[PDB]
Design a protein around this ligand. Structure first.
Ligand SMILES: Cc1cc2nc3c(=O)[nH]c(=O)nc-3n(C[C@H](O)[C@H](O)[C@H](O)COP(=O)(O)OP(=O)(O)OC[C@H]3O[C@@H](n4cnc5c(N)ncnc54)[C@H](O)[C@@H]3O)c2cc1C
Ligand SMILES: NC(=O)C1=CN([C@@H]2O[C@H](COP(=O)(O)OP(=O)(O)OC[C@H]3O[C@@H](n4cnc5c(N)ncnc54)[C@H](O)[C@@H]3O)[C@@H](O)[C@H]2O)C=CC1
Ligand SMILES: O=c1[nH]c(=O)c2[nH]c(=O)[nH]c2[nH]1
Ligand SMILES: O=c1[nH]c(=O)c2[nH]c(=O)[nH]c2[nH]1
Ligand code: FES
Ligand code: FES
Lengths: 1300, 49, 98, 49
């Protein structure tokens, strides 16, 4: 037939007209209304869409459970399965233990990733009710979180593990009763007896055949060779969504028994080509456990690659044949199958051939030697023989779920009882447009003995054979070439060890014990974490929650999928969809626009352009941006227009039918291009103090250099979203927006429409993260959607896809800095000059304020008597860069620590002594003449250096480095000072509005928006203390321009400070009015006072307001205070680098942070950890690449690698400073959101120390003060570890990417 | 009364914390709110009319 | 509003109280989350009660703008407002009458 | 109020009223109601939270 029948949370779904293009994610959200399952990326990387599938497996005969990405699962692949979503396991009325524990352990901040993490943990428990700690971590390789820093999630869930004042109490968690899980739908057990019959589904464009037998598949493929096989859809779903490929006929063969079988033969194990990688993993693991080592060398190689292959959700449906046939150049499996000579069986109707994978199997890019009518039946992975050894290697940007830069399988077979090579096979991905064998190099080594001459011969061979053009796709040519030689070295040493274990040690020699660590397979100690904070006073009421670790107020609803984000709001029946159409050129005239193909798409409504703007096309913070491009485009990503259609799918298809013709204009891309063209936003900004010429003249030593710092994508898990609801009267419109800036959203919409601000209401319940990326750049979506709604008179919605969001909305500012520092032999700094340049992109936005903040922090923690800092903001043909948590501070301070690192090395003095002796003291003035009062940094420093046992650990690092040639440790301790308040004084204001209803319940609102930082939680804590009633009586529903007007963005870490004061004052107004009633009934409850006030006609509504006093800095006079106070903290971090690959482990991090008297130590520790981990990303993992024509390459989690569960410090300790009230902010607290982020520089400088030790080890030449730009990625680390391999691998000239 | 528009309510649940927004043809937002909240057993602060 | 032109009258009242044209003032709706604990629109008294409320809210805004009107006695309303905003003066007020 | 567009998932309600001035309710039979296409539920006093 043709009906599609499956189950969702126990309820039968009968879909009479299933479209093959419909994903489970879209069906759940749009057809069934179950919006707990989220869209984070649409490409399998983030896990926000994770759900569980159950089915009766006919082949194993039992009920099975596994997780999948709903974003990539075609509904047409799901006949007769049972889906479980977050809504299916529990809700706030009865939470599942998994939901309870993640909420109560502070494992949910913004809450957008929570449902998917919940479902990963839930699926594990359904499979293994007593998991190990290790199994728990592995459950999340496919899940990303941008807010929490992962620690609390793992700590909460460790309570499920068989081998597992405080922030939460695990003793109060309710136990799991597995008998209370949802029944497997009885209908599916009854249907298990019916034979599977072939199904056909027809959509708008695509026909799907679910083949029941091999004969049906082969017949179809003979008659229609164009029929596209789909098994897991983890490649084809990407091809369709992101590369706009349309396969009008698909056949899914997943049901066919022959493609799913596992046969043990004499030569090896044969897997059906449709076998999921999870089944390959389970089978090979069992075989590795029970068979002799001698036989499992190839199995262990496959397992090593599968270890770092995506997550559970991908592996459960990704097929072994799918990987093979996709034939990506960076397949991790094909190099292993090629090196091991794996046997492939190919079939067509009436034909059958077997081939050994070798070079010939892969002719050209993404091709194989299958005929169009052929399918892959099976692959036999072989047993290894006596004297046969195998290694597999992969190096990527991040260990977990990442695309190989280079990947390899290596096999040697020795003549029996010798160390003489009979067979040698070295196969690589990432070095060509296909999986290649080093076929010129390996023949030469046949009959050679395994020795130093063979190593040198093979390395010279590889360096010559595996050449890469300067313009090779993916760049990093020096790195990739270095890795081929480095992997071969590891294999060489490993085989020496393996020969040793076979008793040929006397023939080949033993391994120098300083070399042993080079061959170890990656392993991490189990995690150990500490959170230290201060108990509140003994006398504090139990109902006073200020200072207590109250969970985020929305945590339970976030865990249950009941919390509503913008796109979870139900559509109106008449709602339309919008899609932006963006420039594919960095700088060009628009010569013409052709909408003829767009108009043919069903449901198409209109294409909006500048001509459609009613009033003003001038928008943006400094009024230098278009709503829609007019005559010219000024970046790749510049919005030209917007398509409006009935559905998102139709809007997407119509946007593709908008054809733009351009004429190129001279483009300015890079900071250097801008400098050359005098292309800047405004004048040079400068801070100077003292006498520079004098300071340099007195200096014993002077060091000059440059540093480059890459930008950063916010990667809020919820992208930009707006719903605009027109009201049909007087230009009134209401917008529901994921924004930190309701005021500018409202202003910009009203200006574009030409209506007063009083007509426009902007509402924000919550954001799934913002991080500064929604301070301004949200408005480019909001204005487009508002116009659409105005023009049609219908509600209109747009949520960006991740690729759109990453392209259009910009990021942190790249910085180039040129520094000169003068200092004494003692390490004392006496002179500093730094010129800063940022890449601002194509509108001013916040760029000048960001540079001011960088200049305000160019001191970091250090008193410098003679100092000159300049900044220039470059205007370029790139997307406009904007606020990112830190707002220029991290760039400014990284430059300071970088020259500080060179000061210590030049003086030959311990870096911690040099930093300490240059630190400010209490009462000192900064370079901008602000006095440092309540200067807690020396306490943070002393506490951190003692509690981390920094000196004893220094001893252990030095010992490790003297005993290991090819791994090195590094250890660094870094301080920070971070000025709190917007640099524009009048933005330091906030408001609140409070109502007390006659039942005594309190409705509070304030200008701040919730983005996962627990602001509403804190404001409720504050209000409850101020009013002396329990938090339970106080509610915050949302943020709205029509309850509190003229609000500053939720930014500058300041929102709790500003809104907490406004809330406090509103509360004091209410209490003043209730006083006479309190005096008459001093005992009678709150509710009696309220009802008495009401029946006496006393107002129970009040506004509150606050402005930060005494602010206002002048650049002209270098006077007045920009900041209300400063945050302080210190982090000590330890790393272990792999000198041969550039991978590293973050061994341990210890933070001491001054958050004043914390309003909420759970939320504050969560802010410290989350900010630190974003900084870890910024300085070590996250990198955006751009073509030389200014096109962003890096547009999704496949290529943009944010920290994963496995990325965090193994030992992770956070202490909040005790006994440090800050009485000028609300209830003696300090702001926390941004200051900790820079402390992740401790990992950057620990890396730098470890590279220094590596360079001392190898390289005959050194070069002190070597360059380490940020981020210190595996490429940069590996390239700096100069050795015999980098030497053999070392204009102008087109390349894949350019440094912007 | 024969108001030309008869009595009409749209109630929009928000799925969080008992929150509900009601669009009503009424002269009495306060008693509407109170009476809804009491029937549901939620505080007045959850109910918007 | 039930056809009696109460919002009309309240805009007339606010415009006199603030000394700005009616065109600059808008009422969109009545909501329990902007003004709580309200009596029914009944007893013919709703313009009397709400007019006094509106008047008092407007007097509070005027008191806050007074210094800015002093500094620029001619400069338009829009300049006084923007000066108050950039001086971090609250431009929201409640009003009440019994 | 009724001019406001419906949500895609919006439901409709109709009150069931007494046809007697003063009487005990002996029983209520919803068997025929349950057969009407699109019927969701019949709310009574027992449904009040
Ligand atoms: C988050 C994520 C991480 C990933 N990580 C890695 C990684 O680390 N390493 C890596 O190598 N890959 C990786 N992949 C790629 C992908 O998961 C695999 O290549 C997967 O094995 C494809 O299998 P599938 O069943 O999903 O293929 P599908 O997408 O269904 O099909 C893939 C191709 O194979 C064809 N095909 C499938 N079966 C047959 C057959 N029996 N005969 C002929 N043609 C066939 C299809 O027509 C199609 O052209 C990743 C993908 C994602 C989404
Ligand atoms: N999503 C994820 O996290 C992961 C996905 N995968 C795979 O990554 C793939 C990415 O697909 P695409 O971006 O289209 O990349 P692709 O399949 O074109 O491979 C790009 C890489 O191929 C190599 N390459 C291509 N042509 C070359 C040449 N002429 N010279 C030298 N090297 C060359 C380079 O190593 C380059 O980085 C997916 O199809 C999937 O199979 C693998 C690991 C993780
Ligand atoms: O001084 C700041 N101003 C801002 O507008 C802002 N935005 C942000 O994220 N941090 C900061 N800091
Ligand atoms: O004195 C009155 N009380 C009311 O509650 C009311 N309602 C109304 O319509 N007119 C009057 N008059
Ligand atoms: S939305 Fe499915 S993995 Fe990101
Ligand atoms: S709480 Fe995980 S992405 Fe926000």
């Amino acid at each position: 037939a043709d009906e599609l029948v499956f189950f969702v949370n126990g309820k039968k779904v009968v879909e009479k007209n299933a479209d093959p293009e419909t994903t489970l994610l879209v069906y759940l959200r749009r057809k069934l209304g179950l919006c707990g399952t989220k869209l984070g990326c649409g490409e399998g990387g983030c896990g926000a869409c994770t759900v569980m599938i159950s089915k009766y497996d006919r082949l194993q005969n039992k009920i099975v459970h596994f997780s999948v990405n709903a974003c990539l699962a075609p509904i047409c692949s799901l006949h007769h399965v049972a889906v479980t979503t977050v809504e299916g396991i529990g809700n706030t009325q009865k939470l599942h233990p998994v939901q309870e524990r993640i909420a109560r352990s502070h494992g949910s901040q913004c809450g957008f990733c929570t449902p998917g993490i919940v479902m990963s943990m839930y699926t594990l428990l359904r499979n293994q009710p007593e998991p190990t700690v290790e199994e728990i971590e592995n459950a999340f390789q496919g899940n990303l979180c941008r807010c929490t820093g992962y620690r609390p999630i793992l700590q909460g869930f460790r309570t499920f593990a068989k081998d597992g004042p405080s922030l939460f109490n695990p003793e109060d968690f309710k136990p799991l009763d597995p008998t209370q899980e949802p029944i497997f739908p009885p209908e599916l057990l009854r249907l298990k007896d019916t034979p599977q019959k072939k199904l056909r589904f027809e959509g708008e464009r695509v026909t799907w055949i679910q083949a029941s037998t091999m004969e049906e598949l082969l017949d179809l493929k003979a008659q229609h060779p164009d029929a596209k096989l789909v098994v897991g859809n983890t490649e084809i779903g990407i091809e369709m969504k992101f590369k706009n490929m349309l396969f009008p006929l698909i056949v899914c063969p997943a049901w066919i028994p022959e493609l799913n079988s596992v046969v043990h033969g004499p030569e090896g194990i044969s897997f059906g080509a449709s076998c999921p990688l999870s089944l390959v993993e389970s089978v090979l693991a069992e075989e590795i456990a029970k068979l002799p080592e001698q036989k499992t060398e190839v199995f262990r190689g496959v397992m090593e690659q599968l270890r770092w292959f995506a997550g559970k959700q991908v592996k459960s449906v990704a097929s072994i044949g799918g990987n093979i046939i996709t034939a990506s150049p960076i397949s991790d499996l094909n190099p292993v199958f090629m090196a091991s000579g794996a046997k492939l069986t190919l079939v067509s109707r009436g034909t059958r051939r077997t081939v050994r994978m070798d070079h010939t199997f892969f002719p050209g890019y993404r091709k194989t030697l299958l005929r169009p009518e052929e399918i892959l039946l099976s692959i036999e992975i072989p047993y290894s023989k006596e004297g046969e050894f195998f290694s597999a290697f992969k190096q990527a940007s991040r260990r977990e779920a990442d695309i190989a830069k280079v990947t390899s399988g290596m096999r040697v077979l020795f003549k029996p009882g010798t160390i003489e090579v009979q067979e040698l096979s070295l196969c690589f991905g990432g070095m060509a447009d296909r999986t290649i064998s080093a076929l010129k190099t390996t023949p030469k080594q046949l009959s050679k003995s395994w020795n130093e001459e063979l190593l040198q011969s093979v390395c010279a061979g590889l360096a010559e054979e595996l050449q890469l053009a300067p313009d090779a796709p993916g760049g990093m040519v020096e790195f990739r070439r270095t890795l081929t030689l480095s992997f071969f070295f590891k294999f060489y040493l490993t085989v020496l060890q393996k020969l040793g274990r076979a008793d040929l040690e006397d023939m080949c020699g033993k391994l120098d014990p300083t070399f042993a660590s080079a061959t170890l397979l990656f392993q991490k100690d189990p995690p150990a974490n500490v959170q230290l904070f201060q108990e509140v006073p003994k006398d504090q009421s139990e109902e006073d929650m200020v200072g207590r670790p109250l969970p985020h107020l929305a945590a339970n609803m976030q865990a249950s999928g009941e919390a509503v984000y913008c796109d979870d709001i139900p559509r109106y029946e008449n709602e339309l969809s919008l899609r932006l159409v963006t420039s594919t050129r960095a700088h060009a005239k628009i010569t013409s626009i052709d909408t003829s193909e767009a108009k043919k798409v069903p449901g198409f409504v209109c294409f909006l352009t500048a001509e459609d703007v009613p009033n003003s096309n001038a928008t943006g913070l400094f009024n230098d941006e278009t709503v829609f491009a007019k005559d010219e485009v000024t970046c790749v990503g510049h919005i030209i227009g917007a398509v409006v259609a009935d559905t998102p799918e139709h809007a997407q298809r119509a946007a593709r039918g908008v054809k733009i013709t351009y004429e190129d204009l001279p483009a300015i891309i890079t900071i250097q291009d801008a400098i050359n063209n005098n292309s800047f936003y405004g004048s040079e900004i400068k801070i100077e103090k003292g006498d520079l010429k004098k300071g340099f003249s007195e200096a014993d030593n002077v060091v000059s250099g440059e540093l480059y710092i890459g930008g950063q994508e916010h990667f809020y898990l919820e992208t930009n979203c707006t719903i605009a609801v027109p009201k049909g009267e007087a230009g009134e419109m209401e917008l529901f927006v994921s924004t930190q800036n309701t005021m500018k959203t409202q202003s910009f919409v009203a200006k574009m429409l030409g209506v007063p601000d009083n007509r426009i209401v902007v509402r924000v319940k919550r954001m799934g993260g913002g991080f500064g990326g929604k301070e301004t750049r949200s408005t480019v979506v909001s204005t487009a959607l508002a116009l659409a709604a105005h023009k049609t008179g219908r509600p209109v919605r747009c949520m960006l896809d991740r690729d759109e969001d990453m392209l259009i909305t910009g990021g942190r500012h790249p910085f180039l800095a040129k520094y000169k520092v003068g200092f004494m032999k003692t390490g004392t700094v006496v002179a500093l000059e730094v010129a800063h340049f940022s890449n601002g992109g194509n509108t001013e936005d916040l760029s000048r304020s960001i540079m001011e903040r960088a200049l305000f922090h160019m001191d970091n923690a250090y008193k410098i008597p003679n100092i000159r800092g300049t900044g220039r903001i470059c205007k370029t043909n790139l997307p406009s860069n904007t606020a990112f948590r830190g707002f220029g501070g991290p760039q400014g301070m990284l430059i300071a620590e970088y020259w500080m690192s060179e000061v210590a090395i030049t003086c030959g003095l311990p870096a911690e002594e040099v930093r300490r002796k240059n630190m400010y003291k209490e009462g000192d003035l900064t370079h901008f003449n602000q006095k440092l009062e309540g200067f807690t940094l020396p306490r943070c420093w002393d506490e951190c250096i003692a509690s981390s046992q920094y000196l004893a650990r220094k001893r252990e690092v030095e010992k490790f480095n003297r005993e290991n040639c090819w791994k090195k440790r590094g250890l660094c301790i870094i301080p920070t000072k971070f000025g709190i308040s917007f640099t524009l004084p009048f933005l330091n204001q906030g408001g609140a509005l409070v109502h007390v209803y006659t039942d005594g319940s309190v409705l509070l609102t304030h200008g701040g928006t919730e983005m996962g930082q627990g602001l509403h939680t804190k404001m409720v804590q504050v209000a409850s203390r101020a009013l002396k009633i329990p938090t339970s009586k106080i509610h915050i529903s949302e943020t709205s321009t029509n309850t509190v007007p003229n609000t500053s963005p939720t930014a500058a870490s300041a929102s709790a400070d500003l809104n907490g004061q406004g809330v406090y004052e509103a509360c004091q107004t209410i209490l003043k009015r209730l006083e006479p009633f309190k005096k008459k009934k001093p005992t009678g409850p709150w509710e009696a006072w309220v009802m008495d006030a009401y029946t006496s006609a006393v107002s129970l509504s009040a506004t509150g307001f606050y402005k930060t006093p005494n602010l206002g800095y002048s650049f002209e006079t270098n006077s007045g205070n920009p900041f209300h106070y400063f945050s302080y903290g210190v982090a000590c971090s330890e790393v272990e680098i792999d000198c041969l690959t550039g991978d590293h482990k973050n061994l341990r991090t210890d933070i001491v942070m001054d958050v004043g008297s914390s309003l909420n130590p759970a939320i504050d520790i969560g802010q410290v950890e989350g900010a630190f981990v974003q900084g870890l990303g910024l300085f070590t993992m996250e990198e955006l690449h751009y073509s030389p024509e200014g096109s962003l390459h890096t547009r999704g989690p496949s290529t943009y690698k944010i920290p994963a569960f496995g990325s965090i410090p193994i030992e992770f300790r956070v202490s909040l400073l005790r006994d440090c009230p800050n009485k000028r902010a609300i209830y003696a607290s300090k702001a926390v959101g941004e200051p900790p982020l820079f402390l992740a520089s401790s990992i950057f400088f620990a890396i730098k120390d470890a590279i220094r030790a590596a360079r001392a080890q190898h390289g005959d030449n050194a070069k002190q003060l070597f360059q380490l730009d940020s981020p210190a990625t595996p490429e940069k680390i590996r390239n700096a570890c100069v050795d015999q391999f980098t030497t053999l691998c070392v204009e102008n000239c087109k390349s894949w990417s350019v440094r912007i």
